[PDB]
Amino acid sequence: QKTLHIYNWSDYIAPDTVANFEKETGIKVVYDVFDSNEVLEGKLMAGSTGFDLVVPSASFLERQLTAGVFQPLDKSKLPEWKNLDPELLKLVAKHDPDNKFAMPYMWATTGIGYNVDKVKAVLGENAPVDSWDLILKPENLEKLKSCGVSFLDAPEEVFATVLNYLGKDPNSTKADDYTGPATDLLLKLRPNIRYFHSSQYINDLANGDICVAIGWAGKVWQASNRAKEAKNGVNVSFSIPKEGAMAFFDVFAMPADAKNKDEAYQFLNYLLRPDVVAHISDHVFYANANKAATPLVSAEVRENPGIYPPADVRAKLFTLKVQDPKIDRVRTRAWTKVKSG
Ligand SMILES: COCCOC[C@H](C)N
Ligand SMILES: COCCOC[C@H](C)N
Structure with a gap:
């Protein structure tokens, strides 16, 4: 056998x-x-x-x-x-x-999954669902805090995403980029983040328990499909933001x-x-x-x-490089500081 x-x-x-x-x-x-x-x-x-x-x-x-x-x-x-x-x-x-x-x-790609109606109710009809500003700008996250924010439990993807949003090399080898601006931004956003997890945001997006999430395209599209099949009136969508995104x-x-x-x-x-x-x-x-x-x-x-994604979008995507032992240690220590509690 x-x-x-x-x-x-x-x-x-x-x-x-x-x-x-x-x-x-x-x-x-x-x-x-x-x-x-x-x-x-x-x-x-x-x-x-x-x-x-x-x-x-x-x-x-x-x-x-x-x-x-x-x-x-x-x-x-x-x-x-x-x-x-x-x-x-x-x-x-x-x-x-x-x-x-x-x-x-x-x-x-690692992008933004979101409840269309909830996000538009909180940030208006012109909510920047085409941009990482939706979830990486602290003033927006403070308003979305009440309806639920979820970050993916993937430290290499999140830090590369933040570095690209901050105009720096997504695979930056400069330690100060991680301990300084990347950690600073993530620590401002942290009080508005409900949880860090790589799967729960699927069902939480589907059933309306969270309104915005850093997540993988297919997972978010699955949530959008489950909500459609359940006919619960929940409208989930996914966005590859205009500043680029990580492909895997x-x-x-x-x-x-x-x-x-x-x-x-x-x-x-x-x-x-x-x-x-x-x-x-x-x-x-x-x-x-x-x-x-x-x-x-x-x-x-x-x-x-x-x-x-078409060639227009694929050209703006980036992929992870493997960091050296020092950057890997500094990034791991900052992730722990960010997920604290
Ligand atoms: C034709 O599919 C592979 C294209 O990927 C290009 C990367 C995502 N920048
Ligand atoms: C000590 O058990 C884990 C409890 O986690 C929640 C607090 C905030 N750290």
């Missing part, structure tokens, strides 16, 4: 993906979920994960490669690799040289101690099927990295520029 252990982001797969793979291959898949790059990186660094496939963000995989926690993907076992978008493969190759270790799965690329990778390698390769080839990953995008509201799958994606997802 063949088995396969998969550790993937939560809400990152169609409800029937695994069942169809199981019935076609006869493999029993053990499936578990996470919502934090930090949780996954911690597991990879502390010892055996017990998984055959894991799905870190590409900028995190770059750090993890130097620890040897993955084994390189045998491209002769991934024949439809050519389905992947070349330009996106080129971009991930900055994190994963020669695309030796990482199979791009989905990608999206989540990639499948194979731990160096994976037990069921053959099964894991069968699962990766299953995900390379254009119809397979297009069907996933239809349910999770994330853009996949498969260029052959794009015309198979539903028009609701494919034509949403908050999911498949």
Whole structure:
């Protein structure tokens, strides 16, 4: 009896993906979920994960490669690799040289999810929902405080976002940028922030418990879809702000101690099927990295520029670089100071 252990982001797969793979291959898949790059990186660094496939963000995989926690993907076992978008493969190759270790799965941006009616009730019809001013300007957050503010629990994404908003290098290597202006702004906003979390804002946006959130595009679009299905009158939307935003690329990778390698390769080839990953995008509201799958994606997802952004928007996006030990320590210490309590 063949088995396969998969550790993937939560809400990152169609409800029937695994069942169809199981019935076609006869493999029993053990499936578990996470919502934090930090949780996954911690597991990879502390010892055996017990998984055959894991799905870190590409900028995190770059750090993890130097620890040897993955084994390189045998491209002769991934024949439809050519389905992947070349330009996106080129971009991930900055994190994963020669695309030796990482199979791009989905990608999206870290933007602003918001209740349309609540935000407009508080900040007016012309609320700057096109700008990080909506949530990074203290005077706006003080008014939104009453209706609920949520920051994502991803310190590298938040600090890069703040640095870009402050006109500085999103991957600044100047320590004073973090301890000074970045911390200053985050400490002004902190009293208005209800909580830091990477998943709860989905349901809180859907049910109307919060009105604004720094979050990932697909997660916010899922909340907007759940509110629509519940017919609760809640109107959630997502914004890639005009000042730019962080893009991320989540990639499948194979731990160096994976037990069921053959099964894991069968699962990766299953995900390379254009119809397979297009069907996933239809349910999770994330853009996949498969260029052959794009015309198979539903028009609701494919034509949403908050999911498949056009060249105008993509040119203003930035990606995370891996910081040195000093900046990493200073950023981690400031995050702790910000999440205090
Ligand atoms: C064609 O998709 C990949 C384009 O991403 C460009 C980055 C987000 N700046
Ligand atoms: C000590 O248990 C955790 C309690 O957290 C809330 C306070 C504000 N830190």
